[PDB]
Scaffold this active site. Sequence first.
Site, PDB file in Angstrom:
ATOM      1  N   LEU A  22       0.848  -1.201   0.000  1.00 13.57           N
ATOM      2  CA  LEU A  22       0.000   0.000   0.000  1.00 13.57           C
ATOM      3  C   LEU A  22       0.883   1.249   0.000  1.00 13.57           C
ATOM      4  O   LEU A  22       2.024   1.207   0.472  1.00 13.57           O
ATOM      5  CB  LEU A  22      -0.943   0.023   1.201  1.00 13.57           C
ATOM      6  CG  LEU A  22      -1.960  -1.122   1.246  1.00 13.57           C
ATOM      7  CD1 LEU A  22      -2.798  -1.031   2.507  1.00 13.57           C
ATOM      8  CD2 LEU A  22      -2.848  -1.117   0.001  1.00 13.57           C
ATOM      9  N   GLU A  30      -8.617   0.629   9.617  1.00 12.40           N
ATOM     10  CA  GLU A  30      -9.032   0.528   8.229  1.00 12.40           C
ATOM     11  C   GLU A  30      -8.914  -0.935   7.794  1.00 12.40           C
ATOM     12  O   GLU A  30      -9.795  -1.464   7.114  1.00 12.40           O
ATOM     13  CB  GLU A  30      -8.178   1.443   7.345  1.00 12.40           C
ATOM     14  CG  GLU A  30      -8.884   1.964   6.099  1.00 12.40           C
ATOM     15  CD  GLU A  30      -9.109   0.898   5.040  1.00 12.40           C
ATOM     16  OE1 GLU A  30      -8.161   0.130   4.761  1.00 12.40           O
ATOM     17  OE2 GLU A  30     -10.229   0.831   4.486  1.00 12.40           O
TER      18      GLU A  30
HETATM   19  N1  LIG Z   1      -5.445  -0.007  -1.963  1.00 18.64           N
HETATM   20  C1  LIG Z   1      -6.180  -1.058  -2.325  1.00 18.64           C
HETATM   21  O1  LIG Z   1      -7.464  -1.248  -1.801  1.00 18.64           O
HETATM   22  C2  LIG Z   1      -5.641  -2.069  -3.309  1.00 18.64           C
HETATM   23  C3  LIG Z   1      -6.412  -3.137  -3.740  1.00 18.64           C
HETATM   24  C4  LIG Z   1      -5.834  -4.175  -4.468  1.00 18.64           C
HETATM   25  C5  LIG Z   1      -4.482  -4.132  -4.794  1.00 18.64           C
HETATM   26  N2  LIG Z   1      -3.731  -3.066  -4.366  1.00 18.64           N
HETATM   27  C6  LIG Z   1      -2.295  -2.944  -4.692  1.00 18.64           C
HETATM   28  O2  LIG Z   1      -2.113  -3.020  -6.096  1.00 18.64           O
HETATM   29  C7  LIG Z   1      -0.966  -3.804  -6.390  1.00 18.64           C
HETATM   30  C8  LIG Z   1      -1.377  -5.118  -7.046  1.00 18.64           C
HETATM   31  O3  LIG Z   1      -2.428  -4.890  -7.960  1.00 18.64           O
HETATM   32  P1  LIG Z   1      -2.225  -4.955  -9.559  1.00 18.64           P
HETATM   33  O4  LIG Z   1      -3.237  -4.081 -10.217  1.00 18.64           O
HETATM   34  O5  LIG Z   1      -0.796  -4.645  -9.802  1.00 18.64           O
HETATM   35  O6  LIG Z   1      -2.443  -6.523 -10.018  1.00 18.64           O
HETATM   36  P2  LIG Z   1      -3.461  -7.798  -9.948  1.00 18.64           P
HETATM   37  O7  LIG Z   1      -4.648  -7.618 -10.795  1.00 18.64           O
HETATM   38  O8  LIG Z   1      -3.729  -8.235  -8.563  1.00 18.64           O
HETATM   39  O9  LIG Z   1      -2.502  -8.877 -10.614  1.00 18.64           O
HETATM   40  C9  LIG Z   1      -2.081  -8.717 -11.940  1.00 18.64           C
HETATM   41  C10 LIG Z   1      -2.070 -10.135 -12.462  1.00 18.64           C
HETATM   42  O10 LIG Z   1      -3.307 -10.721 -12.093  1.00 18.64           O
HETATM   43  C11 LIG Z   1      -3.899 -11.399 -13.178  1.00 18.64           C
HETATM   44  N3  LIG Z   1      -5.129 -10.713 -13.603  1.00 18.64           N
HETATM   45  C12 LIG Z   1      -5.475  -9.429 -13.280  1.00 18.64           C
HETATM   46  N4  LIG Z   1      -6.668  -9.169 -13.859  1.00 18.64           N
HETATM   47  C13 LIG Z   1      -7.090 -10.260 -14.538  1.00 18.64           C
HETATM   48  C14 LIG Z   1      -8.231 -10.513 -15.291  1.00 18.64           C
HETATM   49  N5  LIG Z   1      -9.158  -9.570 -15.440  1.00 18.64           N
HETATM   50  N6  LIG Z   1      -8.392 -11.745 -15.886  1.00 18.64           N
HETATM   51  C15 LIG Z   1      -7.420 -12.714 -15.724  1.00 18.64           C
HETATM   52  N7  LIG Z   1      -6.291 -12.460 -14.976  1.00 18.64           N
HETATM   53  C16 LIG Z   1      -6.125 -11.245 -14.389  1.00 18.64           C
HETATM   54  C17 LIG Z   1      -2.898 -11.344 -14.308  1.00 18.64           C
HETATM   55  O11 LIG Z   1      -2.222 -12.553 -14.153  1.00 18.64           O
HETATM   56  P3  LIG Z   1      -1.568 -13.327 -15.377  1.00 18.64           P
HETATM   57  O12 LIG Z   1      -0.479 -12.496 -16.012  1.00 18.64           O
HETATM   58  O13 LIG Z   1      -0.983 -14.568 -14.757  1.00 18.64           O
HETATM   59  O14 LIG Z   1      -2.667 -13.630 -16.363  1.00 18.64           O
HETATM   60  C18 LIG Z   1      -1.979 -10.186 -13.971  1.00 18.64           C
HETATM   61  O15 LIG Z   1      -0.643 -10.429 -14.346  1.00 18.64           O
HETATM   62  C19 LIG Z   1      -0.273  -4.039  -5.062  1.00 18.64           C
HETATM   63  O16 LIG Z   1       0.570  -2.931  -4.831  1.00 18.64           O
HETATM   64  C20 LIG Z   1      -1.418  -4.018  -4.071  1.00 18.64           C
HETATM   65  O17 LIG Z   1      -0.998  -3.629  -2.782  1.00 18.64           O
HETATM   66  C21 LIG Z   1      -4.303  -2.055  -3.645  1.00 18.64           C
HETATM   67  N1  LIG Z   2     -10.800  -0.888   2.348  1.00 19.53           N
HETATM   68  C1  LIG Z   2      -9.697  -1.527   1.906  1.00 19.53           C
HETATM   69  N2  LIG Z   2      -8.553  -1.431   2.619  1.00 19.53           N
HETATM   70  C2  LIG Z   2      -7.427  -2.070   2.228  1.00 19.53           C
HETATM   71  O1  LIG Z   2      -6.346  -1.974   2.887  1.00 19.53           O
HETATM   72  C3  LIG Z   2      -7.474  -2.824   1.092  1.00 19.53           C
HETATM   73  C4  LIG Z   2      -8.660  -2.939   0.366  1.00 19.53           C
HETATM   74  N3  LIG Z   2      -9.766  -2.270   0.787  1.00 19.53           N
HETATM   75  N4  LIG Z   2      -8.721  -3.654  -0.768  1.00 19.53           N
HETATM   76  C5  LIG Z   2      -7.546  -4.342  -1.290  1.00 19.53           C
HETATM   77  C6  LIG Z   2      -6.516  -4.678  -0.219  1.00 19.53           C
HETATM   78  C7  LIG Z   2      -5.186  -4.964  -0.896  1.00 19.53           C
HETATM   79  C8  LIG Z   2      -4.976  -6.459  -0.907  1.00 19.53           C
HETATM   80  C9  LIG Z   2      -4.866  -6.995   0.504  1.00 19.53           C
HETATM   81  C10 LIG Z   2      -5.957  -7.667   1.047  1.00 19.53           C
HETATM   82  C11 LIG Z   2      -5.902  -8.188   2.332  1.00 19.53           C
HETATM   83  C12 LIG Z   2      -4.744  -8.041   3.077  1.00 19.53           C
HETATM   84  C13 LIG Z   2      -4.727  -8.634   4.451  1.00 19.53           C
HETATM   85  O2  LIG Z   2      -3.663  -8.965   4.959  1.00 19.53           O
HETATM   86  N5  LIG Z   2      -5.902  -8.801   5.054  1.00 19.53           N
HETATM   87  C14 LIG Z   2      -6.077  -9.380   6.376  1.00 19.53           C
HETATM   88  C15 LIG Z   2      -5.690  -8.391   7.474  1.00 19.53           C
HETATM   89  C16 LIG Z   2      -6.373  -7.035   7.314  1.00 19.53           C
HETATM   90  C17 LIG Z   2      -5.697  -6.191   6.251  1.00 19.53           C
HETATM   91  O3  LIG Z   2      -4.446  -6.159   6.210  1.00 19.53           O
HETATM   92  O4  LIG Z   2      -6.409  -5.549   5.445  1.00 19.53           O
HETATM   93  C18 LIG Z   2      -7.496  -9.855   6.583  1.00 19.53           C
HETATM   94  O5  LIG Z   2      -8.397  -9.405   5.831  1.00 19.53           O
HETATM   95  O6  LIG Z   2      -7.728 -10.676   7.506  1.00 19.53           O
HETATM   96  C19 LIG Z   2      -3.634  -7.371   2.537  1.00 19.53           C
HETATM   97  C20 LIG Z   2      -3.698  -6.857   1.245  1.00 19.53           C
HETATM   98  C21 LIG Z   2      -6.203  -3.508   0.680  1.00 19.53           C
END
Ligand SMILES: NC(=O)c1ccc[n+]([C@@H]2O[C@H](COP(=O)([O-])OP(=O)(O)OC[C@H]3O[C@@H](n4cnc5c(N)ncnc54)[C@H](OP(=O)(O)O)[C@@H]3O)[C@@H](O)[C@H]2O)c1
Ligand SMILES: Nc1nc(=O)c2c([nH]1)NC[C@@H](CCc1ccc(C(=O)N[C@@H](CCC(=O)O)C(=O)O)cc1)C2
Length: 186
Positions: A22, A30
């Site tokens: 993150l 959160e």
């Molecule tokens: N702040 C948040 O709430 C939040 C939420 C989620 C993630 N994140 C962050 O975002 C980053 C990871 O997310 P990302 O967007 O980089 O990747 P992601 O979608 O989790 O992973 C990318 C890989 O997933 C597969 N994939 C994704 N979409 C697909 C689809 N529609 N159909 C089939 N396969 C699919 C593909 O695998 P293949 O190449 O093997 O096909 C692709 O290489 C991390 O930094 C994480 O912490 C943040």
């Molecule tokens: N509201 C919200 N907050 C967030 O931090 C996130 C999402 N949504 N959506 C996507 C998510 C990113 C992927 C992720 C999902 C889950 C976790 C994880 O360790 N989860 C555990 C611990 C809680 C947590 O770290 O969020 C759990 O749900 O029991 C870590 C990373 C991060």
Amino acid sequence: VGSLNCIVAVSQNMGIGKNGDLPWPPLRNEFRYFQRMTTTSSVEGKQNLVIMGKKTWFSIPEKNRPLKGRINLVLSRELKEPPQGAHFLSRSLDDALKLTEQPELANKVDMVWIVGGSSVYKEAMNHPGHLKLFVTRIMQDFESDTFFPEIDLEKYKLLPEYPGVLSDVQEEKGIKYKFEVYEKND
Ligand SMILES: NC(=O)c1ccc[n+]([C@@H]2O[C@H](COP(=O)([O-])OP(=O)(O)OC[C@H]3O[C@@H](n4cnc5c(N)ncnc54)[C@H](OP(=O)(O)O)[C@@H]3O)[C@@H](O)[C@H]2O)c1
Ligand SMILES: Nc1nc(=O)c2c([nH]1)NC[C@@H](CCc1ccc(C(=O)N[C@@H](CCC(=O)O)C(=O)O)cc1)C2
């Protein structure tokens, strides 16, 4: 079987990740919100399904995989089997949703929660039908390399309040944030 939902935390500049983590420091309440929302089933005897892309799966601390109390499904067009710990693997969101309709999951799954990443969110958001977006707005800019897709604010309406979701600005580690819920009936 039940509702389809996305859940995300985003910075003001729409960032959701930086270098596989993150963009902000751990906000413990959160995280607890994320946990409560994705784990809490509306039906006794059922679990929720969490759907996530491959990079998102590996961004979860190993000690926390699979996410306990939930069914964990990974999306990937190249993996042959789900990564160690994951319960299911599908090639696309449509295939994952069809899987929830088959007998193996039909009576096991309640809500479906999409938890990233960007491409998965975008796919989900445009998918036909009723969808809710649970968006935590982190009220600061953070350097990010991954972003949440723009929300079409005609297509989605912000719910003024939502049961079980706090309305006031929250603050942890000097970072202010607020919980929002959007909906389309599409
Ligand atoms: N702040 C948040 O709430 C939040 C939420 C989620 C993630 N994140 C962050 O975002 C980053 C990871 O997310 P990302 O967007 O980089 O990747 P992601 O979608 O989790 O992973 C990318 C890989 O997933 C597969 N994939 C994704 N979409 C697909 C689809 N529609 N159909 C089939 N396969 C699919 C593909 O695998 P293949 O190449 O093997 O096909 C692709 O290489 C991390 O930094 C994480 O912490 C943040
Ligand atoms: N509201 C919200 N907050 C967030 O931090 C996130 C999402 N949504 N959506 C996507 C998510 C990113 C992927 C992720 C999902 C889950 C976790 C994880 O360790 N989860 C555990 C611990 C809680 C947590 O770290 O969020 C759990 O749900 O029991 C870590 C990373 C991060």
